[PDB]
């Protein structure tokens with residue numbers, strides 16, 4: 178508990194709270210950009226590569242359909258996402274540069290990270306070596322230390338949401354389930370393979386669900402597949418609440434010991450949620466070679482640099498059908514999104 182770390186987190190919370198209490202709004206508009214390519218797509222929104230017409234800079238624009246947000250009951254979650262993203266600041270979190278709305282849509286304009294998703298690189302290589310997995314895991318440990326000290330839970334850790342930048346480091350994206358929480362919270366949300374047992378059982382839960390998800394991620398990076406999988410979600414949930422996990426023989430003894438303490442079904446015994454907090458993780462034998470300050474300062478040479486030609490290259494993302502960005506002549510759902 179060195180005073181330099183305590184003072185760092187105290188200042189981090191001061192700066193977050195000032196932006197949290199006075200958010201920015203309406204800092205660009207759609208016809209300031211040229212549309213280039215669809216980078217991914219979902220049930221109420223998509224992400225598109227765009228170019229700013231006056232500066233030439235590239236950005237990733239997240240577009241949400243207001244009517245579909247209402248129908249799928251995601252109003253509060255969408256308002257959480259933009260308010261948190263405009264208030265945070267950390268080396269491994271993606272930067273929000275603009276936000277605005279119009280008659281039909283909500284827009285969040287982020288920095289474009291051209292190296293692609295961790296998911297693509299993991300599946301192409303097969304599995305990551307333990308030093309490679311540990312480089313990425315250390316970045317997530319520091320990011321969760323930051324978020325939890327601001328009373329934020331993240332709730333969507335998985336390889337699809339971790340983007341690899343030009344230096345080989347992580348940028349975390351997608352804050353659609355992130356929330357400010359003083360105590361417990363109760364919403365059923367997340368991705369099935371990564372959910373903690375207390376979410377599945379409809380209990381009130383806390384930041385310990387992020388430390389469970391870190392155990393799932395480290396297992397998946399080091400093995401090539403997640404610890405709990407099956408064809409139907411109900412079958413995945415039965416394996417999770419049992420907590421029975423089998424480890425490949427190539428895992429080191431230190432790795433198995435860390436994973437047994439992160440994938441602990443009893444949340445009151447889980448690493449990250451004991452009296453010493455994150456320091457039970459930082460001081461574990463599996464992290465003995467990690468220089469925590471050098472990682473934060475980005476002074477460690479990364480194990481892998483993505484191949485791409487420049488800031489507008491899309492070769493590390495995949496191909497989707499290209500659809501219109503339509504804006505109605507009439508305003509939709511104006512009252513619901515007043516504060517956006």
Ligand SMILES: NC1=C(N)C[C@@H](c2nc(-c3ccncc3)no2)NC1
Nearest residue numbers: 217224237287288289290337350351
């Ligand atoms: N399943 C999900 C994806 N598959 C993509 C992800 C997301 N990616 C970006 C992005 C930011 C900057 N540069 C490139 C991409 N923003 O959100 N949302 C969830």
